[PDB]
Structures are given as structure tokens and as C-alpha cells.
Swiss-Prot record:
Protein name: Galectin-3
Gene that encodes the chain: LGALS3
Main location: cytoplasm
Subunit structure: Probably forms homo- or heterodimers. Interacts with DMBT1. Interacts with CD6 and ALCAM. Forms a complex with the ITGA3, ITGB1 and CSPG4. Interacts with LGALS3BP, LYPD3, ZFTRAF1 and UACA. Interacts with TRIM16; this interaction mediates autophagy of damage endomembranes. Interacts with cargo receptor TMED10; the interaction mediates the translocation from the cytoplasm into the ERGIC (endoplasmic reticulum-Golgi intermediate compartment) and thereby secretion.
Tissue note: A major expression is found in the colonic epithelium. It is also abundant in the activated macrophages. Expressed in fetal membranes.
Location of this fragment in the whole protein: 114 to 250 of 250
Organism: Homo sapiens
Function: Galactose-specific lectin which binds IgE. May mediate with the alpha-3, beta-1 integrin the stimulation by CSPG4 of endothelial cells migration. Together with DMBT1, required for terminal differentiation of columnar epithelial cells during early embryogenesis. In the nucleus: acts as a pre-mRNA splicing factor. Involved in acute inflammatory responses including neutrophil activation and adhesion, chemoattraction of monocytes macrophages, opsonization of apoptotic neutrophils, and activation of mast cells.
Length: 138
């Protein structure tokens, strides 16, 4: 595998046309996954599948500025399953991050942090076996 939590440096930050691909398998009895796109201590984009929030499955997205979480954005479409292999693709577009799972569009998240070239690391964490994490310019 890779060791989770896993840091993927994003050299010179993110830019439109940058595609991040994450391959892994969800652990049995998973509780959470998190992708954290970081600008130093700030989290520009937190993508957080929650397998059992009051017996519901929900993806929580948010931004952390100066250690404070903002307004959450919630999605009820939940393509992940305990025990099963997934592919997450995060495409940086001008106005938003665009997320697909298993080749199907899931959600978009408007840029709240504006200094895209300072979003210099991706943290991958949670209840997964992480196979690979990479980027390409499309
Ligand atoms: C108000 O709740 C917070 O919401 C944030 C997003 O708006 C983050 O998701 C926080 O979590 C972390 O930053 C965080 C969590 C764990 C670690 C190890 C590191 C960082 C925290 O999550 C929970 O409260 C929460 C409540 C119930 C369930 C879950 N979950 O992820 O399943 C999260
Ligand atoms: Cl590793
Ligand atoms: Cl900013």
C-alpha cells in the first residue's frame, strides 16, 4: 500500500487543469475518509465521507481558516462502500474543485481560498488501504 495518513506534495500549489487521482479500498466497518488540500495550517478543501453520521452516510465538505471550520457543504450521494475499491478524481477548474468517484461526477466545491498556488499539500487519511496518489496536467 501507502501508509495513511499520506502526504502528497503539490509543487507550486494547484492550478486549473491539474487532476489528482487517488486509488484505494475502503476498510471493512469504515467510519471516515478525508482529503485535506492544505495551505499551510489552513484547509482550502476538506472532503470528508462519513459512513455513520446518525446512521446516515454523508460527504461533508468545508474550509478551515485560522483553525476555524466554515459553513459545511453536504451531498447525500454516497458512492463509497466498506470493503470496496474506489477511484477519486479531483479536477481543479477555474471556479471550483470538481470531484468524480469511480468515473461518475459527484460534486463541485467553489474556491473559498483564492491563492491556489499556495495549496501545496494534499493529506489523505481515514479508513482506507491507499493504493496510489498522483497528479497530472490535462
Ligand atoms: C464539526 O465537526 C467537524 O467538521 C469538520 C468539517 O466541517 C471536520 O470534519 C472536523 O474533523 C476533523 O477536522 C478531523 C477529524 C478526525 C481526525 C482524526 C482529524 C480531523 C470535525 O468533524 C467532526 O466533528 C466529525 C463528527 C462525526 C464524524 C466525523 N467523521 O469524520 O466521521 C467527524
Ligand atoms: Cl507511504
Ligand atoms: Cl486566499
Amino acid at each position: 500500500m501507502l501508509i495513511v495518513p499520506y502526504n502528497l506534495p503539490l509543487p507550486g500549489g494547484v492550478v486549473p487543469r491539474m487532476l489528482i487521482t487517488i486509488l484505494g479500498t475502503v476498510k471493512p466497518n469504515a467510519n471516515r475518509i478525508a482529503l485535506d488540500f492544505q495551505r499551510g495550517n489552513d484547509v482550502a478543501f476538506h472532503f470528508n465521507p462519513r459512513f455513520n453520521e446518525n446512521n446516515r452516510r454523508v460527504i461533508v465538505c468545508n474550509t478551515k481558516l485560522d483553525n476555524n471550520w466554515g459553513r459545511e457543504e453536504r451531498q447525500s450521494v454516497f458512492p463509497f462502500e466498506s470493503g470496496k475499491p474506489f477511484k477519486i478524481q479531483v479536477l481543479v477548474e477555474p471556479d471550483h474543485f470538481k470531484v468524480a468517484v469511480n468515473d461518475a461526477h459527484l460534486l463541485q466545491y467553489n474556491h473559498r481560498v483564492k491563492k491556489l498556488n499556495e495549496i501545496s499539500k494534499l493529506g489523505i487519511s481515514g479508513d482506507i488501504d491507499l493504493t496510489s496518489a498522483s497528479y497530472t496536467m490535462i
